[PDB]
Every structure is written in structure tokens, then in C-alpha cells.
Amino acid sequence: VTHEQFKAALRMVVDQGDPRLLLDSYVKIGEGSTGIVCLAREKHSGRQVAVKMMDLRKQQRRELLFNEVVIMRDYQHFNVVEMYKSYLVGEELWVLMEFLQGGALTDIVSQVRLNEEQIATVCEAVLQALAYLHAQGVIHRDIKSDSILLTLDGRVKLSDFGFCAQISKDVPKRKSLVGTPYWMAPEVISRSLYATEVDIWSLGIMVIEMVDGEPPYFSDSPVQAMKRLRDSPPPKLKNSHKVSPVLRDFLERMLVRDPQERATAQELLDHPFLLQTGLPECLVPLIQLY
Ligand SMILES: [Cl-]
């Protein structure tokens, strides 16, 4: 797919309009090998946005940018980092995103072992996002601690939709090997037909991150880890002694090989473990420390 064909594809799906007339008060806050990020203000609402300005001539895996724009433009949820607009601006794609300042969950969970109230607070938020996305037929496919972003006031939001997919009556299952090795569901690794259940497995691995500090098999090569995950009974907590019977049960609903037996996001929202959910404030001191 040439640069010219990709622009043509994007032209069909992006918002109309030219953000060079619509935004102001730009401040460069980031840069990468394929673009920059600027904070800016939307003129009539005053809203602050983070504008990813992607040089499509340098960008690779351009199909992922297309898929995220096409899929996520029409979904919104309080626990999902919102994509307000996307625009084709000459040779670049500008994507206007909700701006958050509390870092990523990994910043904290790499350093500290969350208590069960904190774990419940995080899981309840991610599960509200997933229950909404799954009901829409969206599969995230890259759930892991660093896909979870936080606000300074302790709100928990899901981000990093690069690998997302949309299922439909017509195409009800995916079979692509996508995601991040240590968090991939066994059926993804085996390239079986799969649907929204894979995000629940990944969430289970994230719970292990929260309790233990790292996912299973983390010292193995990513290829070796995938082989063990593909073949083996589900991985267990290293710190199993730490965890309440109710949290053990919650985790055991997630890390289930048989995707039909595995819990759905809605089942997990209804689980007694989430009776332990705290106020956003329960994360705020940690977010400030890390
Ligand atoms: Cl924030």
C-alpha cells in the first residue's frame, strides 16, 4: 500500500475539516520517530486536546492507524481514553485525543504491590470499559498494565487501541496473532477463531502483574513464553498466599483455557470481589509518588 493509496483510504474515513483553522495554542509535548504530539485548544469549546501529528511517510503498520480511526471514532465511554477527531492534514494524520496526566498503571505496579481495594478499583474501571466495548463487538487485543492510563484525580482509563478489531454478524470471529506475548490468550497464540474472550485472559494476566509485580514467564524469551502459554494449564500467582478467597475466585474466572467457560466482562462486573472497589482517591497518593 503506497503513501498515495493510504491517504486515499484515510480520506474516506477521517473527519472533514481542517484542524489548522480549528485549533490554537499549540505546545509541543512529545516527539517520536514518526511524529510529534502537541497540546492544543479547540476554538469554540475551549477543550484541551493532545494532537498526535503522524507523518504518514514515516509511519509503519499504517493499517493499525486506519483500523483505530474507523473503529473507535464512533465509540465513547468514561473509562476509555476518547478519540475526539481525526483529520488528514496534507501528508500527516492528526488524531485529537483526550489528555491525561496521571501516568500509566505500570508506573505504580512495577514498584508497589496494590492492595485488594486498589486492585478492585482498577479492575472495576477496566471491566466497565470492556463490558461496553464488548457489547459493541470491539475487541481491544492489547490489554496490559501500560495500556491502562490514570488521571491525577485517580480515574482509570483504557488506552492503546492500535490492535483493536470489530466483530460483526458477517465476520463474528478473528484469527490474527496480535497482542503482546506475555498477555496473549492461548487461542490467539494458536490462531484459533476467537472473539471478545481474549481480552478477559489478558486482564487475568494484568491481575497477576498487580499481585506479583510481573506477568508469568517474564524471564523467558517472548517466543518461549508464547509456547508455554499456548500449551500449558493457566499460570498461577507466585503470591497466592496473599490473596483473599474472593480475589482468587475472580482471577480463576479469567485465567480459563476454554473460552466458552471463561468469564465475560459483564460476569466479572457482577462478581463479589468488586464489592471491594474504592474511591478514585485510593489511587491518588500512589500516582503522585510514581
Ligand atoms: Cl489528568
Author numbering: 385 to 674
The study reports:
PAKs are serine/threonine protein kinases that are regulated by Rho GTPases of the Cdc42 and Rac families (Knaus et al., 1995; Manser et al., 1994; Martin et al., 1995). In humans, the PAK family comprises six members, which are classified into groups I (PAK1, -2, and -3) and II (PAK4, -5, and -6) based on their domain architecture and regulatory properties (Bokoch, 2003; Jaffer and Chernoff, 2002; Kumar et al., 2006; Zhao and Manser, 2005). Group II PAKs (PAK4–6) regulate a wide variety of cellular functions, and PAK deregulation has been linked to tumor development.
Finally, we solved the structure of noncatalytically productive apo structures of PAK4, PAK5, and PAK6. The activation loop residues important for autoactivation (Ser474 in PAK4, Ser602 in PAK5, and Ser560 in PAK6) were completely phosphorylated in all structures determined, and the presence of a stoichiometric phosphate moiety was confirmed by ESI-MS (data not shown). The structures of group II PAKs showed that this consensus motif is embedded in a deep cleft and is not accessible. In addition, PAK6 has been reported to be responsible for regulation of androgen receptor signaling in prostate cancer (Schrantz et al., 2004; Wang et al., 2005).
